[PDB]
A paper describes a structure:
Disulfide-bond-forming protein A (DsbA) catalyzes the formation of the disulfide bonds necessary for the activity and stability of multiple substrate proteins, including many virulence factors. DsbA works in tandem with its membrane-embedded partner protein DsbB, which is required to maintain DsbA in its active, oxidized state. B. pseudomallei is a Gram-negative bacterium that is found predominantly in tropical areas and is the causative agent of the deadly disease melioidosis. Binding was characterized using NMR and X-ray crystallo­graphy. Both 1 and 2 bind to a transient (or ‘cryptic’) pocket on BpsDsbA located adjacent to the redox active site which is not observed in the apo BpsDsbA structure.
Oxidized BpsDsbA was co-crystallized with 1 in 60% Tacsimate (Hampton Research); the resulting crystals diffracted to a resolution of 1.84 Å on beamline MX2 at the Australian Synchrotron and belonged to space group P212121. The interactions between 1 and the protein are mostly hydrophobic, involving the side chains of Tyr110, Trp40, Phe77 and Leu112 from the original copy of the protein and Val12, Ala13 and Lys15 of the next symmetry-related protein molecule in the crystal. Additionally, there are π-stacking interactions between the aromatic rings of the fragment and Tyr110 (4.1 Å, measured from the centroid of each ring). The fragment binds within 10 Å of the redox active-site residue Cys43. During refinement of the structure, the optimal occupancy of fragment 1 was found to be 0.62, suggesting that the observed density reflects a mixture of the apo and fragment-bound forms of the protein in the crystal. The signal was particularly intense for the Br atom, where difference density was visible even above the 20 r.m.s.d. level. Two additional residues, Ala72 and Lys108, showed a CSP of >0.02 p.p.m. for 1.
Numbering used by the authors: 7 to 197
Amino acid sequence: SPSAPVAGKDFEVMKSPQPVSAPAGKVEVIEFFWYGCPHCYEFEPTIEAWVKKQGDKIAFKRVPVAFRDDFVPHSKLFYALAALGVSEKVTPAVFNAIHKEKNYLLTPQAQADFLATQGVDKKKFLDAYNSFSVQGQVKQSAELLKNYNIDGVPTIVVQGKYKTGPAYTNSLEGTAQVLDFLVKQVQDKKL
Ligand SMILES: C[C@@H](Oc1ccc(Br)cc1)C(N)=O
């Protein structure tokens, strides 16, 4: 309690809370992230383990962020992987390509070529990349950026109402600690 996160400093209370897509008894958690964001990369093992530990207690999703036109292909990539059902399999290698191999995967052809080395059929991937369904999800993700007033990554949103992230806590461990506190406060009907 004396060490509890401080509202307005360690997390932000949104003036316009957003609809929650989680069912009763689950806390919704959203991570806005960008494949090219170093803190998002570093945070992956931390948030993966925490989400897996919560299990059915939460409904977790990621939303890709393209702050610039040049990075819209990274949001298309995110939704194309999900459409193919290979996200869990290849996403570590995608992060590795960008952050360690200097392959920024900025075009659909570079993505397809890389993903083929990971066992993804290029025609299937490019069909997903260019599909109307993925284009719809990308346009939606940009509307979500606006609706949650997101101006940095990674940003974690709890129950459509509480935002945290290293912009707030100045550390990834602090982000995880605030997230855990927020979810517990929502479960206990304190937030
Ligand atoms: C890790 C790498 O940073 C980048 C991340 C995404 C993009 Br796109 C371009 C560069 C670096 N040069 O240290």
